[PDB]
Write a structure and sequence with these properties.
The structure is cut from a larger assembly and holds chains A (465 residues), B (473 residues) and C (113 residues). With 465 residues, chain A is an alpha/beta fold. Chain A contains 19 helices and 15 strands. The chains are: A alpha/beta (465), B alpha/beta (473), C mainly alpha (113). Bound molecules: FE(8)-S(7) cluster (CLF) and magnesium ion (MG) (2 copies). Chain B: Belongs to the NifD/NifK/NifE/NifN family.
Chain lengths: 465, 473, 113
């Protein structure tokens, strides 16, 4: 009677949305590019609220501009707001190189011709700044489909199309392209170490390491993406693409395969031990480079740590997970490796027809010994309502906008994915890879341990485990 | 004079928005343009009209569904971002609602989607019987008639009451338009649609206070001590139905004249309720305000007992901070009113010199007030943008900036500390105790070892790492 | 001297008071007249008007100003009743000039609130 079931939310409305809309994800893609300021064509909230969201997750400012759509543009069209916004950016930011022009619900409904505005602005910019090149990428992100997950993927693809259209194929680079998806700076730091230890040259798109920027004696601001125009252009010349996230950049790997014959390898997102193992085996396959002893050791240190926890504290404990689809499916697999039982998986957008085909579903169907409900098109009320109706959970894993569900239900909660604003430093802590699996397992245990103390639930047992 | 900053040489229209107050000027010749269109591409701090209606005003209420008719982003974006507690477990902060508009609703209309969402929300939370519905950009563009849908829902569900606001983000130029549409709709439709028991000889509404970190609950300890019944708070720690009773008050006390002056003005026009403007931030300001309220009611002695007690309790701490904050330079980059509520109160009560101020969305009215109260040599900026903020820092070298968290995290890189001028650090900030809380946070922000440590380059052989000695009131 | 006294009163009102900065011309005019008539009564020992709610509110605003003027300005306890009246008439005129006649606030005459 052992069943993994997919079902949609049964309400038309949303209470407590899991994700933001497409333009927010497009903004996130863009802020990882060096010398990039996205221009969000729509009303002002579509920009300012998302800059706040990034400040909540990262505790940093990122630069994004608005076209400031007002009432006259709503009657007559907003092309002149785009055109003005591009020139005002170029004139006031002399080092600016890349402007993704991101549409919103408003500017999709009114049908402004973004590509026509880009032709105008390219002519204007070439005349006014003869020795400068600014890349204007059209990013179509209506908010009434998909989510910030889809918007991220669309923006990455559009930027890559724009820049590679301009530079084409050159000399082979010998490098990998790597699209990790929507991950933290700590995940990027871990991936760079893995490629360094394996002696594999790679560009990570986007390289967000420096989002965790120092406060320096010289008062310098370093809070920027590290991925340059040149890095993106060089993607045409790669040996191969490693795509870690089906829903967060694999479509750019495919585009590069179609356009430039760079072979794309999509692998399971590397949450947990097996998925990391399989990622490293694919890297070895495509590069001919051996997996180093250092990664066998990091793997062994992670397993050693998780073995102190799994049968003692985790076995038979029931977990609900919410977040981006690649993260939810990957964390469900990690959970199983450590004897946790992920009985409720919530994925927050309208992409169910794709999720039903995800091979990780089948990997769960063939392995779980407990029923799993996967709710797609879910909101966070879908979690709260199930708890109120009697679902017994030992743990929630998800982002901070679900915090009150866990607090009020008195269920321990580990903060994963985006945004994680209600704890300190999580953006710096890997979640992927072997060290990430270890860090996740130890967050889970430490959340359970604190819960045992606050609730006086066998709190004396934390001595000789 | 009016100022053309170097970063605005290619947008020189910005000079009419920036005033540097100089000796002997007739300030009537130098009033910034305000409440005009934004320049695209500037990194203006402005938000949208929907924000001003739902996030700022309507969403403060403790017992009301906030139904955002539009795609899900407008809902996501106004959830987990405000600090307005309630006395019912923070219902207002725990939830947000969307009609989850999809492409088919753009094509065919969203009215049935809204109607279904509204019934679902009432079904999911059977204890909640009040709702505000807001339009957003695309639902305005497709012409959904949310007032007509709300009328049908109320007919079908006679135990609910629904209010509607037409506030797409492209309306107006900023949050301000949302304030106006909400205020006028509420007084036109919902005031005097029920009544409550009057339990005091002295009754008032408190208009334009949104309970940031408990401000409203702190002020309520004053009204309870004075024996004044507050018919309605607009909208801090408020209820939908209290707001229906606003016509019953004898007096309207206004703090936020920008967001909420509209409804005070209409209550005076329609019901004869006088409008009293106060400053509920600032120590000596709070005393003036209590004295005015008590003079209106004829309870002067009770006012002087409360003031005396509050001064005995809090003035020694306030003066401790003044000794240490005297001469520090402050910038205030917020919505608008806090500029004119704070510039002279920090000067009087803390000795702090406000050297630069920027208003996201203030009107010319707000600039009249701030320039009247503010110092010579100070910059007064309407609709400031990020590059201007950097240039202003270079001109005035503030010791502390009161602004939102994102800007605070930016200026941290320049070793300038911030206090959250919107949601506070450790509030409340209104009232006598509140101004001490504000002073404490300013003191701990500036006299902070980390700021000194950041300046040391450990590679410089010539440099040592200092220790600083701090204090506490 | 009479112009110094008026300059003192005007600088006090500008930096302290809010009632001259209401949303519309007609409200500024009402408040300037109403508050300052009460101030004149209070500074000359006359019985304040406290009948109607509006009168009671002008009294409340005026009391703050009268008390502050007596505390700040020694001259305000030395000049006679007619001199106080003349100063307050001059102050009304100045306040109308700067808050209405020469204000560039473009909302002041909008018929709707
Ligand atoms: S200016 Fe304001 S916040 Fe912007 S849309 Fe308009 S009412 Fe709303 Fe909404 S769903 Fe996302 S965030 Fe926008 S693109 Fe539309
Ligand atoms: Mg060990
Ligand atoms: Mg003055």
């Amino acid at each position: 009677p052992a069943e993994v079931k997919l079902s949609p939310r049964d309400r038309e409305g949303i209470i407590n949305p899991m994700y933001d809309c497409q333009p927010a994800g497009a903004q996130y893609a863009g802020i990882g590019i060096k010398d990039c300021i996205p221009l969000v064509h729509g009303g002002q909230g579509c920009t300012m609220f998302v800059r706040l969201l990034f400040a909540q997750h990262f505790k940093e400012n990122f630069d994004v501009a608005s076209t400031s759509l007002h009432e006259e543009s709503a009657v007559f069209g907003g092309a002149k707001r785009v055109e003005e916004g591009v020139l005002v950016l170029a004139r006031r930011y002399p080092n600016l190189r890349v402007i993704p022009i991101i549409t919103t619900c408003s500017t999709e409904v009114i049908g402004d011709d973004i590509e026509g505005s880009i032709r105008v602005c390219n002519r204007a910019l070439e005349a006014e700044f003869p020795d400068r090149k600014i890349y204007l990428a059209p990013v179509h992100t209506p908010s009434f489909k998909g989510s910030h997950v889809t918007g991220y993927a669309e923006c990455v693809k559009s930027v890559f199309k724009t820049i590679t259209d301009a530079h084409g194929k050159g000399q082979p680079s010998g490098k990998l392209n790597v699209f990790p998806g929507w991950v933290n700076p700590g995940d990027v730091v871990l991936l760079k170490r893995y490629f360094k230890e394996m002696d594999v040259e790679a560009n990570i798109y986007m390289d967000t390491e420096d989002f965790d920027s120092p406060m320096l004696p010289n008062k310098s601001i370093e809070t920027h993406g590290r991925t340059t125009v040149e890095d993106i252009a060089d993607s045409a010349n790669a040996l191969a693409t490693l795509s870690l996230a089906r829903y967060e950049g694999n479509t750019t790997g495919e585009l590069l395969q179609k356009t430039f014959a760079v072979p794309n390898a999509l692998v399971n997102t590397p949450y947990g031990i097996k998925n990391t193992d399989d990622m490293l085996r694919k890297i070895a396959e495509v590069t001919g480079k051996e997996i180093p002893e250092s990664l066998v050791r990091e793997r062994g240190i992670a397993l050693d740590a998780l073995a102190d926890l799994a049968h003692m504290f985790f076995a038979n404990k029931k977990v609900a997970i919410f977040g981006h689809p690649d993260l939810v499916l990957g964390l469900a697999q990690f959970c199983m490796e450590v004897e946790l039982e992920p009985v409720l998986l919530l994925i927050g957008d309208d992409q169910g027809n794709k999720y039903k085909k995800d091979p990780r579903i089948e990997e769960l169907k063939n392995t779980a010994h407990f029923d799993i409900e996967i709710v797609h098109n879910a909101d966070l009320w879908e979690l709260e309502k199930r708890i109120n109706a009697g679902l017994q959970l030992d743990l929630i894993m998800g982002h901070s906008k679900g915090r009150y569900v866990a607090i009020e239900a008195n269920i321990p909660m580990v903060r994963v994915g985006f945004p994680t604003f209600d704890r300190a430093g999580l953006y710096r802590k890997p979640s992927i890879g072997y060290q990430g699996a270890m860090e996740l397992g130890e967050m889970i245990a430490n959340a359970m341990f604190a819960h045992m103390e606050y609730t006086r639930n066998k709190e004396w047992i934390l001595n000789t485990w | 004079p009016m100022v053309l900053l170097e970063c605005d040489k290619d947008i020189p229209e910005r000079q009419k928005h920036i005033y540097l107050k100089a000796p002997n000027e007739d300030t009537r010749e130098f009033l910034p343009i305000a409440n005009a269109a934004t320049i695209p591409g500037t990194l203006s701090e402005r938000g949208c009209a929907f924000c001003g209606a739902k996030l700022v005003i309507g969403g403060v209420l403790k017992d009301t569904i906030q139904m955002i008719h539009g795609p899900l982003g407008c809902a996501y974006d106004t959830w987990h971002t405000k600090r307005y507690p309630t006395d019912n477990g923070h219902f207002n902060m725990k939830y947000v609602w969307s009609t989850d508009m999809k492409e088919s609703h753009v094509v065919f209309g969203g009215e049935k989607r809204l109607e279904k969402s509204m019934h679902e929300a009432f079904d999911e939370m059977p204890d909640i019987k009040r709702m505000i519905v807001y339009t957003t950009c695309p639902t305005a563009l497709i012409g959904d008639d949310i007032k007509a849908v709300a009328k049908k829902v109320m007919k079908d569900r006679p135990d609910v009451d629904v209010f509607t606001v037409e506030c797409p983000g492209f309306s107006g130029v900023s949050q301000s338009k949302g304030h106006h549409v909400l205020n006028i709709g509420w007084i036109n439709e919902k005031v005097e649609t029920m009544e409550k028991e009057i339990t005091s000889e002295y009754t008032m509404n408190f208009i334009g206070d949104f309970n940031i970190q408990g401000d409203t609950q702190l002020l309520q300890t004053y009204w309870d001590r004075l024996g004044i019944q507050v018919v309605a708070h607009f909208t801090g720690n408020g209820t939908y139905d209290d707001l229906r009773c606003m016509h019953q008050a004898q007096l309207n006390v206004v703090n936020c004249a920008r967001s909420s002056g509209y409804i005070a003005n209409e209550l005076k026009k329609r019901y004869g309720i006088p409008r009293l403007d106060i400053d509920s931030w600032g120590f000596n300001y709070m005393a003036e305000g209590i004295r005015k309220i008590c003079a209106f009611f004829g309870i002067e002695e009770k006012g002087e007992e409360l003031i005396a007690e509050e001064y005995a309790k809090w003035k020694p701490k306030l003066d401790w901070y003044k000794e240490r904050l005297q001469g520090k330079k402050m910038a205030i980059w917020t919505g608008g009113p806090r500029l004119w509520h704070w510039t002279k109160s920090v000067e009087d009560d803390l000795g702090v010199q406000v050297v630069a101020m920027s208003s996201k969305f203030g009107h010319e009215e707000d600039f009249e007030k701030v320039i009247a109260r503010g110092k010579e040599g100070t910059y007064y900026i309407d609709d400031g943008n990020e590059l201007e903020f950097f240039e202003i820092i270079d001109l005035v070298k503030p010791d502390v900036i009161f602004t939102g968290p994102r800007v605070g995290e930016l200026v941290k890189k320049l070793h300038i500390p911030y206090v959250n001028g919107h949601g506070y650090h450790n509030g409340p900030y209104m009232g006598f105790e509140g101004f001490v809380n504000l002073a404490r946070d300013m003191y701990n922000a500036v006299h902070n070892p980390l700021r000194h440590l950041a300046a040391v380059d450990i590679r410089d052989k010539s440099q040592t790492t200092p220790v600083i000695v701090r204090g506490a009131a | 001297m009479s112009q110094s006294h008026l300059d003192d009163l005007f600088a006090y009102v500008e930096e302290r008071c809010l009632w001259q900065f209401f949303s519309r011309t007609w409200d500024r005019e009402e408040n300037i007249e109403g508050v300052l008539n009460q101030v004149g009564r209070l500074l000359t020992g006359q019985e304040p008007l406290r009948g109607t709610p509006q009168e009671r509110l002008f009294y409340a605003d005026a009391l703050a100003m009268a008390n502050d003027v007596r505390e700040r300005f020694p001259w305000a306890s030395q000049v006679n009743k007619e001199e106080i009246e003349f100063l307050l008439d001059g102050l009304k005129s100045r306040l109308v000039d700067v808050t209405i006649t020469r204000s560039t606030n473009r909302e002041l005459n909008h018929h709707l609130y």
